């Protein structure tokens, strides 16, 4: 159940672990490219917000699903912020989204008055006007229903074949984590010089009980030097001060 690009869907991924284990290496994908984190490290990180955008586009439109890349699909249907963190995943889908006479179940917005801002999902069907006469719901001349289906066919050129695109968008550890790659825990060690990882904030120091309180949504703090001052332990939620090793 992939969406028309003009009305791309989105699902939230939360309160779960792993499956960032370079799944793309199964080579079922025509392309896989990350704009933030290098793919092999995704499975070592924790995230606070993970979402998957799901839609079908033509092969020559795959190149438009990128930060900084303009064009009608990029501007009228699905748009990424240029400051994008996430990975764009895509594959050929002729076995599902193509028909001999054309698979017309997927709509594109071709006619629009203005460009989208990041992640705006405009599902409006207002007839588009392109001229001095109002053409109010007429269809023809200066106005058209904004959406057009494309007849995907198994025999068309590759750029005209359907591709399924999933964009995995995410935030980094600037809040308590909800989604993590697979990790093996070890016990909390207090005092002594210890190398720690938690949800990230990797470093070495001496962990002692803190006399601090954090607001419920803060997870960790920062010093004037922008280094972690203290962290909350993901398990049991004690606040630990990180002092330097002598």
């Amino acid at each position: 159940r992939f969406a028309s690009v003009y009305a791309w869907n989105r699902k939230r991924i939360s309160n779960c672990v792993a499956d960032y284990s370079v799944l793309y290496n199964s080579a079922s994908f025509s392309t896989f490219k990350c704009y933030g984190v290098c793919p092999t490290k995704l499975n070592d990180l924790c995230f606070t917000n993970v979402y998957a955008d799901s839609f079908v586009i033509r092969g020559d439109e795959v190149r438009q699903i990128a930060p900084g890349q303009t064009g009608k699909i990029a501007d009228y249907n699905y748009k990424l912020p240029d400051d994008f963190t996430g990975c764009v995943i895509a594959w050929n889908s002729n076995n599902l989204d193509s028909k001999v006479g054309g698979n017309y179940n997927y709509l594109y917005r071709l006619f629009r008055k203005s460009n989208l801002k990041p992640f705006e999902r405009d599902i409006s069907t207002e007839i588009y006007q392109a001229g001095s006469t109002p053409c109010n719901g007429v269809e023809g001349f200066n106005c058209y229903f904004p959406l057009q289906s494309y007849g995907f066919q198994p025999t068309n050129g590759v750029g005209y074949q359907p591709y399924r695109v999933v964009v995995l968008s995410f935030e980094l550890l600037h809040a308590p984590a909800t989604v993590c790659g697979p990790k093996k825990s070890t016990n909390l060690v207090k005092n002594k010089c210890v190398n720690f990882n938690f949800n990230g904030l990797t470093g070495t120091g001496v962990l002692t009980e803190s006399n601090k309180k954090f607001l419920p949504f803060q997870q960790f703090g920062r010093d004037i030097a922008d280094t972690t001052d203290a962290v909350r332990d993901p398990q049991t939620l004690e606040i630990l001060d990180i002092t330097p090793c002598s």
Partner: antibody
Amino acid sequence: VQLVQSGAEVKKPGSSVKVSCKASGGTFSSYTISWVRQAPGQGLEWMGRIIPILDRVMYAQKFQGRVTITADKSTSTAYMELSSLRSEDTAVYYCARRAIDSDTYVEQSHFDYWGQGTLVTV
Amino acid sequence: EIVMTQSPATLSLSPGERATLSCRASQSVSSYLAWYQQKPGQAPSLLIYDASNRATGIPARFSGSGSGTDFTLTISSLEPEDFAVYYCQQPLTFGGGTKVEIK
């Protein structure tokens, strides 16, 4: 670019008139084709316009239901069908090119090249 | 459709005289008019598009004017070969037409 149409025909009442105009060169990817009827003793009566690019056809209210337009995907082939031919509906009818377009979809405001036509009767 | 009325039903003038042909809409069409010249045995050809803007291949004697609902076709000097029936067309359909005859 071109408006190469069919020859003339005579047929049984109720039968469909199925003819097409073929436009070569760059017509397919640009300009659309409009069908108009030169009824005798009258002015021209526009019937409809086909746009193979947008998968759309525009129609005169006068000819809705009876006129439908089909087209191919290579040579722009404006395959107009007039259902239910009546003997009183005897006319020379033809295709014309709508020479104005844009990528901003102002599309077709007017005509340029007209093909004159062929006669259909009973 | 867009309903247009033309006037006179028949215009009567001598060759060399100016011919003025009227077309009036029930609704505004901005500048979207075309004018055409019909002859016995010939479907009318394009003279003007965009109300006043002369069509390619058409002699300078033809021009138009008007906007909104009120339009005119002017032939500055009608030639003996121009005693045609003239028509207006809106984005969609044609008006009634004016026959032009020699006085």
